[PDB]
C-alpha cells in the first residue's frame with residue numbers, strides 16, 4: 001500500500017549527497033554485488049504526516065528523526081544525510097502525494113519511511129562509497145480500535161537482539177533481522193509482541209521488537225513512571241522522549257533506570273506496578289495486559305488499559321492532531 | 336571483477352525454491368519496500384573453485400558450505416535452500432564460466448559467493464515469504480605474496496560484533512555491518528585486521544572480522560594448537576574445522592577452549608605462545624605478527640611466520656591443489 005511517488009538521493013564519495021529527485025514509486029536496480037545485499041549496510045527511520053482539521057499537513061518531531069538517521073548512519077559507517085536534506089525530502093514527497101494523507105483527526109496518518117542502503121558493488125568487507133536514500137509512504141492507522149486494545153507479550157529468554165558495544169542504539173536493519181526468530185516463538189505461545197532482555201546479564205528489560213516500554217508504579221497523584229534507561233543497546237525512541245516530557249508536564253515523577261524481569265513480575269503481582277504500556281510511532285501507546293515469561297503468565301492489574309496510559313495517550317495524540325497546544329514546538333508544517 | 340554469468344533461484348511460499356536458471360550477470364530489480372532493504376533479512380556463503388593440473392575444476396568441502404547456508408538461514412528465519420540445490424548451482428555456474436577459473440596450482444582460484452536475500456515487499460517486520468538466491472563468481476588470489484605476509488591486528492575494546500543469543504554463529508550480513516566502524520579505528524592505528532572480544536565479559540577472544548584465530552603454544556613435538564571454542568557468537572569456520580583435523584593428522588594436541596586477551600598478551604610475552612595465525616577461505620592461513628591492545632603493542636615471537644603455521648598451510652593448500660592425498664574426502668569435482 002504505497003503512494004504514487006518516492007524521493008531518491010544518491011551518494012558518491014566525490015559528490016556527497018546529490019541528484020535529489022522525486023520520481024514514480026517503482027522497482028529499483030542494484031548490482032548483484034551491491035554491499036547491502038551481502039553486508040547489510042543500511043539504516044532507516046519511521047515517522048508520520050498528519051492531516052489537520054484546517055487542511056494543513058504536519059510532522060511530529062521530524063527534526064528528531066533527521067538527527068537519529070544521522071546517528072544510526074554514523075554507527076553503521078554511512079555518510080550522514082544532512083538534516084535539511086532529510087526535512088526537504090519530506091516536503092517534496094508531501095507536495096506531490098498529499099492526497100494520500102488520510103482525513104483528520106483520528107488514528108489515521110501517512111507513514112513515512114526514509115531509508116539508506118549501500119549500493120556500491122564489490123565483495124570487499126568495508127564501508128561503501130556509494131549509497132542511495134529513498135523516501136516512501138504508506139497510509140496507516142485504519143482498523144486501529146482506537147489504539148487501545150491491550151496486547152500480550154513474550155519475554156525472550158533464548159534470543160538476544162543487540163548488545164552493549166553493538167548496534168542496538170541505531171535504527172539498523174540487522175537488529176530487526178536478529179529478532180525474527182523470537183517473534184515466531186511469541187506467536188506459537190499466542191503472544192502479540194516480544195520483550196527483549198539485556199545481553200550481558202539476561203535480566204534487564206530493554207524494549208519490544210518495535211516499541212519502547214513504560215511501567216506505571218502506584219496510582220493517583222502518587223503515580224510514577226519508570227522506563228529502561230538508555231543502555232546503549234535499546235533504541236532512543238522519539239515517542240519515549242516525548243512521553244517523559246508529557247509526564248513531567250502532568251506532574252508525574254519519572255525514572256529512567258534499569259529494571260529487571262524479576263522486579264516487573266514481583267511488583268505486578270504485589271500491585272505496585274499498576275500499568276504497563278509500549279510506545280512508538282505507529283501505535284503511539286499500546287497497553288500491555290499480560291506477560292509470558294518462560295512457563296509463567298502474569299496479568300497487569302485487571303488486564304485493562306490503565307488510567308495514566310490512556311491519559312498520556314490522549315495528550316500526545318491531541319498535540320499530534322492539533323487539538324491540544326504544542327508547548328514544546330514538536331509540530332511543523334509539511335504542506 | 337565478476338564472471339559472465341550468475342545462477343538465480345526464487346522462493347515463494349506456495350512453490351518453495353523454484354525457477355533455478357543461469358543468466359548473464361547484470362543488475363537485478365527490487366521493490367523499494369523489499370524486506371532486505373529495511374530489515375536486512377539475508378545470509379551468504381563463500382567458497383572457491385580450484386583448477387587442477389589435469390584440467391578438472393574442484394570444490395573444497397562445498398557440502399559444509401551448503402549446510403552452513405541452511406544453518407544461517409534457519410537463524411535468520413529464511414527457508415533453507417536444500418544442499419543438493421546449493422551444490423547443483425555451483426556445477427551449473429562452473430559449466431558456463433569455467434574459463435574464468437584461474438590456472439593451477441598456486442594461490443589463484445575462483446571465489447564463489449552464494450547468497451540469499453528477502454525480496455517480499457511490505458514494511459511489516461516479519462520473515463519474508465519471497466526470497467531470491469544468487470550465485471556469483473570473482474577471480475581471486477593474485478598478488479598474494481604466497482599468502483605468507485604477516486598481519487598486525489587491532490583488539491576491539493569499544494565495539495562488539497555479536498553476542499550470545501544473537502546471530503554470530505550465522506554467516507549473516509548484519510554481523511559484518513556491525514563491524515565496519517571498528518575496522519576504521521584499526522586502520523587509523525596502522526592495523527590490518529580486527530580481533531573481536533566476547534560480548535558478556537569483554538575479554539575472551541572470538542575471531543577476526545573475516546577469519547578464525549589459532550594460537551600455537553610451545554614448539555617441536557611439544558607444540559599445541561588452541562583456538563576459541565564455539566561460543567555461539569563466532570563463526571564455525573570450515574577452514575578452522577579442517578585445520579583441527581590436519582593438526583590431529585600431524586600428531587599435534589588441539590584444544591577448543593576459551594582464551595582471553597590477558598592470557599594471549601601474557602603468554603606471548605613469556606614465549607609460551609610461539610605463533611598466532613588467522614584462517615579462512617580467501618587467504619587459507621595468514622600469520623599474525625603484532626597485536627595492538629589499547630595503548631600497548633606486542634609482537635608474536637620474531638614477527639615472522641611460524642613453523643606450525645606454515646606446515647599446516649602447506650598441507651591444506653596441497654590437498655586443495657591435488658598435490659597431497661585427500662584422506663577425509665574434502666575434494667569434489669565441479670567440472
Ligand SMILES: Cc1ncc(COP(=O)(O)O)c(CN)c1O
Nearest residue numbers: 210211212235237238239280281
Ligand atoms: C526497536 C524499536 N524500539 C523502539 C521504537 C520506538 O521508536 P519511536 O518512538 O521513535 O517510533 C522503535 C520504532 N522505531 C523500534 O523499532
Ligand SMILES: Cc1ncc(COP(=O)(O)O)c(CN)c1O
Nearest residue numbers: 545546547570572573574615616
Ligand atoms: C566472521 C568470519 N569468521 C570466520 C570466517 C572463516 O570461515 P571459513 O573458514 O569458512 O571461510 C569467516 C569467513 N567466512 C568470517 O566471515
